[PDB]
Structure 1
Amino acid sequence: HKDHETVRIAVVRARWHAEIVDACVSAFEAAMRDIGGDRFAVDVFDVPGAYEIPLHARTLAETGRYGAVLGTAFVVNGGIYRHEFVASAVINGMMNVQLNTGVPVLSAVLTPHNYDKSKAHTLLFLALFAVKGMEAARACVEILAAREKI
């Protein structure tokens, strides 16, 4: 038939610092509508944190119900322990998932240099996440379409 099918996109988002993580997701969804032109539709799923994204995203990617998956989280230094170990496992995890499933996984998992949850920091990240959301939507449409050209 003629390909007029909606491309399904999944977003998997961490519940920590949801006010910030969701800023990205909301911006992403709006941008997908602005760019996609209803050629794309997005479903959103929650995950406890960044750590579980690679399995949740994969379970979903291997289902064949999505053209692409966006993982997102705000991973910060809590002042107690080193967060780098998880952040490393997660970025490598998502990289491995797209290489194992054939479904591109975009990363919107941020590891800031500094975040003390100050008034200014909270506000800064809400805005920066909204920007990343918009960038991810553009990346989504362009990469999905680009792989279709091979």
Structure 2
Amino acid sequence: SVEVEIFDVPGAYEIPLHAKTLARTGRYAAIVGAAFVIDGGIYRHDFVATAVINGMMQVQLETEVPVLSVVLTPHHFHESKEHHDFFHAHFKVKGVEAAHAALQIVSERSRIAA
């Protein structure tokens, strides 16, 4: 009964504007943004993550459309073989949690909308 549409963006920095553009057309009861923001060991990465999270919250408050966050920043990721498998396995659990959260929040908004 629920249809999912997939949109591609180059990086996490491009997510808030795409979400705002998609939300203003109606047609969607919720929006999910997924990204993997890691520390590459050369440049600082916290600025971009903070900007993306804040922008997603701002778009959510502006357009009155729920935005679920699957933008995750691990404590350590050294691109080793051990690190790859762990997060490769954990993102499935993250996706299931996001699906449950989206369903619940849409139902709750529909209920309180009388």
Per the TM superposition, whether the score is higher than 0.5 is yes
Secondary structure at the aligned position of 1:40 is classed as coil
Is 1:72 the counterpart of 2:37 in the alignment?
no
How far, CA to CA, are the matches of 1:103 and 1:81 in structure 2?
33
Is 1:93 the counterpart of 2:40 in the alignment?
no
Secondary structure at the aligned position of 1:73 is classed as strand
Secondary structure at the aligned position of 2:5 is classed as strand
How far, CA to CA, are the matches of 1:50 and 1:129 in structure 2?
16
Deviation at 1:65, TM superposition (A): 1.4
Deviation at 1:63, TM superposition (A): 1.0
Question: Which residue in the other structure is 1:131 paired with?
Answer: 93
Aligned-residue Cα RMSD (Å) equals 0.6
Q: Paired residues, what number?
A: 112
How far, CA to CA, are the matches of 2:41 and 2:29 in structure 1?
38
Q: Give the gaps of 5 or more residues in structure 2.
A: none
Q: Give the gaps of 5 or more residues in structure 1.
A: 1-38
Is 1:48 the counterpart of 2:21 in the alignment?
no
Q: What letter is aligned with 1:97?
A: V
Secondary structure at the aligned position of 1:109 is classed as strand
Q: What letter is aligned with 2:46?
A: E
Question: Which residue in the other structure is 1:113 paired with?
Answer: 75
How far, CA to CA, are the matches of 1:117 and 1:80 in structure 2?
14
Structure with greater strand percent: 1
Sequence identity of aligned pairs in percent? 64
Question: Which residue in the other structure is 1:57 paired with?
Answer: 19
What TM-score do the two structures reach when normalised by structure 1? 0.73
